[PDB]
Design an enzyme around this catalytic site. Structure first.
Site, PDB file in Angstrom:
ATOM      1  N   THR A 156      11.557  56.749  53.759  1.00  0.00           N
ATOM      2  CA  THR A 156      10.908  55.318  54.586  1.00  0.00           C
ATOM      3  C   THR A 156       9.787  55.611  55.308  1.00  0.00           C
ATOM      4  OG1 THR A 156      13.248  54.641  54.979  1.00  0.00           O
ATOM      5  CG2 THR A 156      11.611  53.299  56.142  1.00  0.00           C
ATOM      6  N   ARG A 184      23.960  50.136  49.105  1.00  0.00           N
ATOM      7  CA  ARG A 184      23.388  50.856  50.153  1.00  0.00           C
ATOM      8  C   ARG A 184      22.547  50.702  51.358  1.00  0.00           C
ATOM      9  NH1 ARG A 184      19.336  54.008  53.421  1.00  0.00           N
ATOM     10  NH2 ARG A 184      20.245  55.475  54.210  1.00  0.00           N
ATOM     11  N   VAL A 185      22.157  49.481  51.801  1.00  0.00           N
ATOM     12  CA  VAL A 185      21.326  49.937  52.992  1.00  0.00           C
ATOM     13  C   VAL A 185      21.537  50.138  54.633  1.00  0.00           C
ATOM     14  CG1 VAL A 185      20.242  47.258  54.477  1.00  0.00           C
ATOM     15  CG2 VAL A 185      21.561  47.067  52.294  1.00  0.00           C
ATOM     16  N   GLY A 186      20.180  50.607  54.362  1.00  0.00           N
ATOM     17  CA  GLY A 186      19.779  51.404  55.385  1.00  0.00           C
ATOM     18  C   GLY A 186      19.374  50.990  56.774  1.00  0.00           C
ATOM     19  N   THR A 207      11.576  56.267  60.503  1.00  0.00           N
ATOM     20  CA  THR A 207      11.434  57.258  59.643  1.00  0.00           C
ATOM     21  C   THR A 207      12.758  58.388  59.635  1.00  0.00           C
ATOM     22  OG1 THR A 207      10.781  57.976  57.469  1.00  0.00           O
ATOM     23  CG2 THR A 207       9.548  58.483  59.241  1.00  0.00           C
ATOM     24  N   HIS A 209      16.738  59.857  58.455  1.00  0.00           N
ATOM     25  CA  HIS A 209      18.417  59.434  58.168  1.00  0.00           C
ATOM     26  C   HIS A 209      19.014  58.218  57.857  1.00  0.00           C
ATOM     27  CE1 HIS A 209      22.821  59.677  58.210  1.00  0.00           C
ATOM     28  NE2 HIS A 209      22.210  60.206  56.905  1.00  0.00           N
TER      29      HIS A 209
END
Ligand SMILES: [Cl-]
Ligand SMILES: [Cl-]
Ligand code: NA
Ligand code: NA
Ligand code: NA
Ligand code: NA
Ligand code: NA
Lengths: 296, 296
Positions: A156, A184-186, A207, A209
């Site tokens: 990210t 999948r949204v993070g 930024t 995991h």
């Protein structure tokens, strides 16, 4: 009035090859440069971070826009958010396809809807409504990303700024993690996780995991410690250490306080970063290997 | 080992009619008795919060699952999330359509996938792969929400629990807001905004104007105050106080602390709520308008 500042980051992840590093350096430079130009011309914090992030989106070297990592079906699916520190106004999109700049769509969510966050179908419809081009999906996909997806089966980016009225803001954008499930949204579109911006404290973009950042609310946790009078480097270290010690998560963040202090810290192996202030440009990737060049 | 407690909330919203108050009470008292009955078996806080929310989803009077409000295109798109304070594990979904039980799918996201957040088409695929049945939209739409939309052209439900082994959880589920843009996402699937759980502090679920709740990250905020030494009530007062001043948004929340202390509080006019602990049901809708009763 405040001396403006912009800080930018790429992925908080593992080590990076030497040839990449050079391509990477230039990218952190182009976005830091672009963001600071905005601030030096009277622009707002939101303009600046929107500007830097776009640069990294358009740069195929970074996991955002063109160059996003692939889902488990070899399509790009992008998340982003932006936030105005003044009234905490915010905009977000998740799982958007077939656009160049999710961060700009994000900005339109904020400014041209009474909402803060759209996803997938609706996000795409809203894009169409705003006259946002629809690009062939294959344009965002790079040949090198394919080799990540083909292989993995068998980070990210973002920005923070402080502007000349003392306002603050973050922007963030990502393609996610390689071989993610479809949809999948993070952490990115989730306020308080992927970033947070409040004028009474400062601003943060994270930024690393995604799921770990989400679970611990890394951006807003970082600012809480600043609320209790920890320094910026003190807060980033506590917050990041807690993601490590509680949910075994690694990553990075950047911060700017409402008084102008800033830092970039990471528990991941590396995190490309750059900071522009007082007419000079700071850059790095690995711990204790920064460079500081003059920004004319 | 601690005394088990479940708290449930309906939508933090407008005046309820005298006529309609009894039937909301009926569904709420049911929701809580499900959760509490699960706890009495020595069930987990996560089990208890899910069953409590499944009951409100299935009940058509409440704005989640069946009885969800309609979006601008006449349809139900749903958000939900669940969290386990033991290890911060979580699952969440957004913009899901044609399934009876969003909260059940967020738990499957927690437990069955490497991720915490699926959305829209990605969520449809996962729900299919796990055998979730396709339910027609016509079986999710109430005559009230067919009509209520026309008026434009209620709120989010939740639960928190502390189980017989000291674990706290939250769950929450919603149809969103009437005539919302397609793919609008509120606080409900954003960890820290719609709710947060942490065995080392407590568990909260929020309701109200979801854009406000996201902006202030209301649920994590309440826990910041608790951690700082405030009672559950003060903490609720402060976070809802802040949301009101800073973003001019109304809502409410339920919170149960690691020590089995609990509260329901709101700045909206109404917030249906019910709690079960020590063989007693406490329930209300309007402030200072609470009753206690024995449970079987
Ligand atoms: Cl200054
Ligand atoms: Cl107890
Ligand atoms: Na990078
Ligand atoms: Na890019
Ligand atoms: Na319902
Ligand atoms: Na998890
Ligand atoms: Na999971």
């Amino acid at each position: 009035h405040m001396n403006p500042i912009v800080v930018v980051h790429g992925g908080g992840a593992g080590p990076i090859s030497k040839d990449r590093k050079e391509r990477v350096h230039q990218g952190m430079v182009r976005a830091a440069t672009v963001g600071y130009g905005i601030l030096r011309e009277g622009g707002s914090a939101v303009d600046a971070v929107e500007g830097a992030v776009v640069a990294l989106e358009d740069d195929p070297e970074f996991n955002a826009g063109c160059g996003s990592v692939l889902n488990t079906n070899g399509e790009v699916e992008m998340d982003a958010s932006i936030m105005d520190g003044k009234d905490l106004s915010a905009g977000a999109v998740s799982a958007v396809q077939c656009i160049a700049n999710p961060i700009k769509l994000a900005r339109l969510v904020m400014e041209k809807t009474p909402h803060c966050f759209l996803t997938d179908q609706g996000a795409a419809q809203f894009a169409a409504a705003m006259g946002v081009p629809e690009i062939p999906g294959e344009k965002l996909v790079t040949e090198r990303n394919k080799k990540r997806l083909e292989k993995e089966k068998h980070g990210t980016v973002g920005a923070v700024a402080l502007d000349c009225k003392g306002n603050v803001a973050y922007a963030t954008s990502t393609g996610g993690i390689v071989n993610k499930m479809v949809g999948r949204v993070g952490d990115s579109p989730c306020l308080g996780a992927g970033g947070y911006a409040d004028n009474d404290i400062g601003a943060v973009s994270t930024t690393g995991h995604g799921e770990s950042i989400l679970k611990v609310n890394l951006a807003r946790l970082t600012l809480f410690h600043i609320e209790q009078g920890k320094t910026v480097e003190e807060a980033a270290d506590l917050s990041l250490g807690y993601m490590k010690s509680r949910v075994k998560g690694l990553g990075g963040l950047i911060v700017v306080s409402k008084t102008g202090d800033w830092v970039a810290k990471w528990t991941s192996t590396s995190m490309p970063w750059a900071a522009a202030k007082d007419g000079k440009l700071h850059f790095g990737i690995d711990p204790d290997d920064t460079t500081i060049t003059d920004l004319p």
